[PDB]
Amino acid sequence: MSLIEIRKRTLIVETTYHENGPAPAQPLKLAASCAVIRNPYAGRYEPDLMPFMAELRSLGTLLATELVDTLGKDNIEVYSKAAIVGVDGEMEHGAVWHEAGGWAMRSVLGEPKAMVPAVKAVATAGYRMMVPVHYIHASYVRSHFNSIEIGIQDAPRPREILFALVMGTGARVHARLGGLTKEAVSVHDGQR
Amino acid sequence: SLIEIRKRTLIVETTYHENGPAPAQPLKLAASCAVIRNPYAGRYEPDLMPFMAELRSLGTLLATELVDTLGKDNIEVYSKAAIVGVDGEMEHGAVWHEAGGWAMRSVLGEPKAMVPAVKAVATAGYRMMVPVHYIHASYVRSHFNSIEIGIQDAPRPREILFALVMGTGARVHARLGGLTKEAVSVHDGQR
Amino acid sequence: SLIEIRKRTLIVETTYHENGPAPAQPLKLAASCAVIRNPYAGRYEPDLMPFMAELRSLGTLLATELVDTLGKDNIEVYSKAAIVGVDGEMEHGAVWHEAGGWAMRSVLGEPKAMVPAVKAVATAGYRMMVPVHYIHASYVRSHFNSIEIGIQDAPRPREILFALVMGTGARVHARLGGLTKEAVSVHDGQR
Amino acid sequence: MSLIEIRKRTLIVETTYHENGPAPAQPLKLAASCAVIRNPYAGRYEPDLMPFMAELRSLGTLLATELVDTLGKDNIEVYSKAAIVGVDGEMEHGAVWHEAGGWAMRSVLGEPKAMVPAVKAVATAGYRMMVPVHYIHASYVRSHFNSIEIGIQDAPRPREILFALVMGTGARVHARLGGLTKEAVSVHDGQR
Amino acid sequence: SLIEIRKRTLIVETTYHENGPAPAQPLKLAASCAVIRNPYAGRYEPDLMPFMAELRSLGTLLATELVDTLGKDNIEVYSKAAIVGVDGEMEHGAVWHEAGGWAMRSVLGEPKAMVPAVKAVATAGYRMMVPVHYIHASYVRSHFNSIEIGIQDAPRPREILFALVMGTGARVHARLGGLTKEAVSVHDGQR
Amino acid sequence: SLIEIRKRTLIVETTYHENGPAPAQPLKLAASCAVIRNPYAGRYEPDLMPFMAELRSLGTLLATELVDTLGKDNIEVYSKAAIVGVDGEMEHGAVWHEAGGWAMRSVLGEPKAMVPAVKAVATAGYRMMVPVHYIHASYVRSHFNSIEIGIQDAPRPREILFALVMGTGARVHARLGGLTKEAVSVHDGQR
Ligand SMILES: [Cl-]
Ligand SMILES: [Cl-]
Ligand SMILES: [Cl-]
Ligand SMILES: [Cl-]
Ligand SMILES: [Cl-]
Ligand SMILES: [Cl-]
Ligand SMILES: [Cl-]
Ligand SMILES: [Cl-]
């Protein structure tokens, strides 16, 4: 029997035109796909979370696919992943998403090289969290560091977990701090 | 133009269940929001009529996105909301009753129910529950619902966040009787 | 009895101005809230009808307090709200549309406008903007307004917070035209 | 010209019947009266806040009178005072309320002996704050320590201040930790 | 043992100024917090005396950490606080008045002022302003101040967060007169 | 100088367990934060390079405090963060990627892993979860973790809060395999 039971999902698309500076030619879009699932381990200590982590890869694929379909496969430049575990769970129940969300997303995207950044928390329902993103091909590209806030008002309830993926289309709208540029990426190790 | 958009958000919330027997089709509630500069922040402007008039165009934009997102034949509930930044006043949000409501109803081919609403003057990041009801008859009990809106970094003190909401049906475990969609007979927008 | 009250709050908010010319009389918006045990928390109950029926009595209690507080002849706007604790479901709050609305309208001698509403399932301490409109005609534009409600330590997971709101008039700097109280002519509850 | 301009006021009355224990014969009522006023010093450093503090005594009297009229003069057993200053102000703009709110309230109440407890903060509009209360005749009466949350959704705006007084009618609903009792008060110094 | 510690936090806040002429030395306020299991969560326990007794050692632990952090000779203000998880009750935090206060006063060589306090029953992540006053005379007007405490993931429903606060001086721009440190003469803990 | 510090906070969070078998030694995560005036609040400044350069010394200050708090030989995870006040912009926080990261890495003798980060433009009191990872190899799965930061009264609209985080080890009940500290072999800062 599946360990994955979805109560609700949210898709958010934030389009930023400017931040009071000269507007860029095209706006930035950052998008998050979230799913609220029952936590099969809430309220007890389970030493073996490996089966759960394995099955969650399919959830990763589902959410990542939705994001590509939303933004367009050719438009992805930044990503992230995140988890919010309900108060009857533990951090480790969210930590399964590093592999499940990250690997699934990277596979959907043709295996870009940058590690997918992440943030997670154990929190009360409605908790809002800033999710950091970076460039999919080289984590050090300075223009692309950014953030989007995620959260669902009534989730995760104590015995639930909220899993999320984030994708975006470009650089900060007024990026102007130099550093490594897309054109300067030369190692192709996922960093520089 | 009195309308200068900094950012927009589109939210689609799909509910499969709420721990009861899952309905055949999930519910989708969607919100389309725009954060704009408040041209009147920091002073008392006696005439907000031109602003209210022009805002209808923002209503059209947002409503059009919602219909494109959910499908025109799939709309059953709606709402409108405004959050005014702390340097503004409530009246700056009140303009949206007409601007958002009339624009959305026009987009939808003039359904009869008044569009429900909520508004506040608040700090950036304020989150607000937005109530929805049935577009053809406000009293259809199965359809009363809510969705939370908000943007983390908005409205900043001299901004306004305007939003519209559309949805596809009843609460996932609606079971409290009352007037049903099918029983609607007066067509006055209530019953 | 399905109604076990832990605590109640009564809030009266008097607004003198919002940085414009102060009206002759300030506006008062008041909310009366009750936190009760949710008899259905933690399970799916198919029949919420008895609960909805009994809750009318809670509606009467709260509405009566509001009228006693503001004065019966001074009521111009109203609303109703519910916040369900995290172990409950939205349907547990939905019972209040009838229970709170009908009870309040009865207390007020059956004004014609549907009582507006908002609800959520939320954590203890959740705060919610509650929209109000004119009791005799929902379209009276001057009267659309809001008040925030909430109780710091409620609803706890197995509780429900039910609330009613009454107010004494228009927004303090209402100036957006629309249908006025005086122009009300249809008496259908809208116009 | 007056330094006191009120935008809005709130009166809250919280009645507690129980906290899942055996209910007391009469419920506890805790009430807060708040006023949101313009801050005449927002955005600058003013060395002399003494005139403002002096005039604010009248605001203290107004709010304290409202509370007695609400709860009944014969029913008061606990109190407190609090201030929330908008973000363009400073803590000192709230600190004026120790004297202005405290002394005014004590005078309205016939000069009970216990110092009025207090809390204050400089915060964003909508900030919610727990206000602690204690027994008006002897601060150490253990049964009476309690709290009520105050706040106004849209206040204080940056250039405003929210001032508040609190009064209440008795002990915690399930007080059971011994300590100094009302009957044991014998020094009458405001402590014991 | 009735004391099972999940996590602890120590926070030291240094204030150089608040947009006025900076004082000679900055103010430091420090909070030491401990999150523990609530042995009584979910039931009404009439006898909390053994718990209150045992908590004295937790008071001593937190107080000793604060003295070791700021330096015994530098302490001029203090406070105590408790946040109880939502499955508990207020009385579960009330035990800290004696356990925290007496332990801290003992550690500090019995200063005379009553330790001020604030408490709440709240959801995980609740943030609370904690008021401090002068350790030798509660009326010393320059010393009234506050610090915010809270832990993001605590107290969970079956936990309690207990905290102590110490600080090194007056508000950075204290200028409202009243009783001064130097004018203290009663030594009753008030004046 | 473009750096004017109003206040600083140091927080050390000690985790003994998270309801599982407690590890041999607890985890400590520490955050060092500084609230400064935003020299650019309210205007678009095209050249933020001098500010970014000058901020390096603030990075060194905060990093040195963290090493002195936890001990240089005990550091295994780090992060950096910024919260910009509402009158600023995101770019005002973005300067901290280099200023914070490079300063901290220098203090730590140049560990290879990129310092993770998160930033926001927000209202005073905004709380933010900050993610950490292993300082020698970002992929070490046991070490991914987070700590919440924030100051109640900061950043005010014309301020910025800059922060660094260091920690001493893995999650208290890390058990998901993946790359281990011991298996690190590339030394590129990833694996
Ligand atoms: Cl990854
Ligand atoms: Cl409408
Ligand atoms: Cl109704
Ligand atoms: Cl006093
Ligand atoms: Cl005591
Ligand atoms: Cl004490
Ligand atoms: Cl960098
Ligand atoms: Cl770095």
Short mmCIF file of C-alpha atoms in Angstrom, two decimals, chain D residues 75-164:
data_model
loop_
_atom_site.label_atom_id
_atom_site.label_comp_id
_atom_site.label_asym_id
_atom_site.label_seq_id
_atom_site.Cartn_x
_atom_site.Cartn_y
_atom_site.Cartn_z
CA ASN D 75 -15.06 43.90 40.81
CA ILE D 76 -11.46 44.82 40.14
CA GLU D 77 -8.70 42.57 41.40
CA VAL D 78 -5.92 42.63 38.77
CA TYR D 79 -4.41 45.19 36.39
CA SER D 80 -1.68 46.02 33.92
CA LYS D 81 -0.63 48.58 31.37
CA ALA D 82 1.04 48.33 28.02
CA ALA D 83 2.33 50.22 25.02
CA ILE D 84 3.11 49.41 21.40
CA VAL D 85 5.03 52.08 19.52
CA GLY D 86 5.09 52.23 15.75
CA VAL D 87 8.27 51.54 13.83
CA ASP D 88 9.15 55.21 13.25
CA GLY D 89 9.20 55.82 17.03
CA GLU D 90 11.31 54.61 19.92
CA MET D 91 10.80 52.64 23.12
CA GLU D 92 10.96 55.84 25.17
CA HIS D 93 7.71 57.00 23.48
CA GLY D 94 5.98 54.01 25.05
CA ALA D 95 7.84 54.30 28.34
CA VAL D 96 5.94 57.49 29.11
CA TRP D 97 2.94 55.20 29.85
CA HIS D 98 4.47 53.78 33.04
CA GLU D 99 3.62 57.03 34.81
CA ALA D 100 0.78 58.22 32.57
CA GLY D 101 -1.15 54.94 32.52
CA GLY D 102 -0.13 53.58 35.90
CA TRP D 103 -0.75 56.66 38.00
CA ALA D 104 -3.98 57.53 36.26
CA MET D 105 -5.32 54.03 36.74
CA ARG D 106 -4.26 53.82 40.35
CA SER D 107 -5.98 57.16 41.00
CA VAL D 108 -9.23 56.00 39.35
CA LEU D 109 -9.12 52.91 41.57
CA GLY D 110 -8.63 54.71 44.95
CA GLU D 111 -4.83 54.22 45.06
CA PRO D 112 -4.37 50.45 45.37
CA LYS D 113 -0.82 49.69 46.52
CA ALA D 114 0.63 47.26 44.01
CA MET D 115 2.79 48.65 41.21
CA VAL D 116 0.98 48.17 37.94
CA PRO D 117 2.87 45.60 35.84
CA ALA D 118 3.68 46.46 32.26
CA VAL D 119 5.08 45.40 28.92
CA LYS D 120 5.93 47.44 25.85
CA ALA D 121 7.40 47.06 22.41
CA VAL D 122 8.23 48.97 19.22
CA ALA D 123 6.57 46.95 16.48
CA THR D 124 4.82 46.76 13.15
CA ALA D 125 1.11 47.38 12.75
CA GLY D 126 -0.90 44.41 13.97
CA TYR D 127 1.64 43.24 16.48
CA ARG D 128 -0.01 41.14 19.21
CA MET D 129 1.36 41.20 22.75
CA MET D 130 0.71 39.23 25.95
CA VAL D 131 0.11 41.62 28.83
CA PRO D 132 0.75 40.30 32.29
CA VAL D 133 -1.45 41.14 35.24
CA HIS D 134 -1.23 40.83 38.97
CA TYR D 135 -3.24 41.53 42.14
CA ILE D 136 -3.88 45.20 42.77
CA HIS D 137 -3.30 45.06 46.53
CA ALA D 138 -0.28 42.80 46.82
CA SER D 139 1.81 41.86 43.83
CA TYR D 140 2.87 38.49 45.29
CA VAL D 141 -0.63 36.90 45.50
CA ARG D 142 0.11 33.81 43.46
CA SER D 143 -3.38 32.90 42.38
CA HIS D 144 -3.78 36.14 40.42
CA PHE D 145 -0.80 36.18 37.99
CA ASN D 146 -2.31 36.06 34.55
CA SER D 147 -2.20 37.39 31.00
CA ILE D 148 -4.33 38.81 28.25
CA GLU D 149 -3.28 39.42 24.62
CA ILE D 150 -3.77 42.87 23.12
CA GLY D 151 -3.35 44.34 19.67
CA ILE D 152 -5.13 46.16 16.87
CA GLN D 153 -4.86 44.84 13.36
CA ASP D 154 -3.94 48.09 11.67
CA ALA D 155 -2.08 49.74 14.52
CA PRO D 156 0.21 51.22 15.47
CA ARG D 157 1.12 52.44 12.03
CA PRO D 158 4.72 53.71 11.84
CA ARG D 159 3.96 57.18 13.22
CA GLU D 160 1.48 56.09 15.89
CA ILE D 161 1.44 54.69 19.40
CA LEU D 162 -1.03 52.23 20.95
CA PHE D 163 -1.55 52.72 24.68
CA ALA D 164 -3.48 50.25 26.80
#
